[PDB]
């Protein structure tokens, strides 16, 4: 008959990797998570306790609870025609900090520094990011760069 277990179709997902089997390094236990941190979920096959379900692999959530060896994460799961909040208790071996969040915090403090600097001059900081604008005019010279003419090539077997 059909089979839909807790770890169905997790063969390659919960595989470890090439050549980083064995125990996990100590930075995963030395990292500190706080309520409100944004964390990514990537399960570790070596640690069978506190594993997330396969749906939450590669999902990003917010910490809401900190325990002895685990972390409570809130995920938004798409069920039917709406999202539900799902509270997960995951051991920290399946959890890493999101890098986008800290890079946004560095952008926040950089914008704060820019504003605090240019408040003393009133030079219209323009702190917003901008997309890749179309490139403006330029004058390209041919000194040592005379154009080299190209032509399409005939057909050849090349076996």
Contact residues: RNA, CB under 7 A: 4, 6-7, 10-11, 14-23, 25-27, 34-35, 38, 40, 45-50, 53, 55, 58-60, 67-70, 72, 76-80, 84, 86-91, 98, 100-101, 104, 107-109, 111-112, 127, 129
R_g of the chain, CA atoms, integer Å: 26
39 sits in which H/E element: strand 38-41
Site for another protein in 83-122 (CB under 8 A): 92
Least Å distance between CB 117 and RNA?
14
Q: Which of 33, 53, 96, 118 is in the footprint of another protein by CB under 8 A?
A: 33
Q: Is 29 in the site for another protein (CB under 8 A)?
A: yes
**Segment contacting another protein by CB under 8 A, of 31-39, 76-84, 105-113, 117-125:** 31-39
Site for another protein in 50-69 (CB under 8 A): 66-69
Task: Decide whether 66 or 125 has the Cβ nearer to another protein.
Answer: 66
CA–CA gap between residue 34 and residue 158 (Å, rounded): 62
DSSP string, 46-97: T--TTPPPGGGTT-EEEEEEE-SSEEEEEEEEEETTEEEEEEEEEEGGGEEE
DSSP string, 110-139: HHHHHHHHHTTTT-----S----PPP----
41 three-state secondary structure: strand
**Which residues form the interface with another protein (CB under 8 A)?**
19-23, 25-27, 29-34, 66-71, 92, 157, 159
């Amino acid at each position: 008959g059909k089979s839909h277990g807790y770890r169905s179709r997790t063969r390659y997902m919960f595989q470890r990797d090439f050549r980083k089997h064995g125990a996990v390094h100590l930075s995963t236990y030395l990292k500190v998570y706080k309520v409100g941190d944004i964390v990514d979920i990537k399960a570790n096959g070596s640690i069978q306790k506190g594993m997330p379900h396969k749906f939450y692999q590669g999902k990003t959530g917010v910490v809401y609870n900190v325990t002895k060896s685990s972390v409570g994460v809130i995920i938004n799961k798409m069920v039917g025609n709406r999202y539900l909040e799902k509270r997960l208790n995951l051991r920290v071996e399946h959890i890493k900090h999101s890098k986008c969040r800290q890079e946004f915090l560095e952008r926040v403090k950089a914008n704060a520094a820019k504003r605090a600097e240019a408040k003393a001059q009133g030079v219209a900081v323009q702190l917003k990011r901008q997309p890749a604008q179309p490139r403006e005019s330029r004058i390209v010279s041919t000194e040592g760069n005379v154009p080299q003419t190209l032509a399409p090539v005939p057909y050849e077997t090349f076996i």
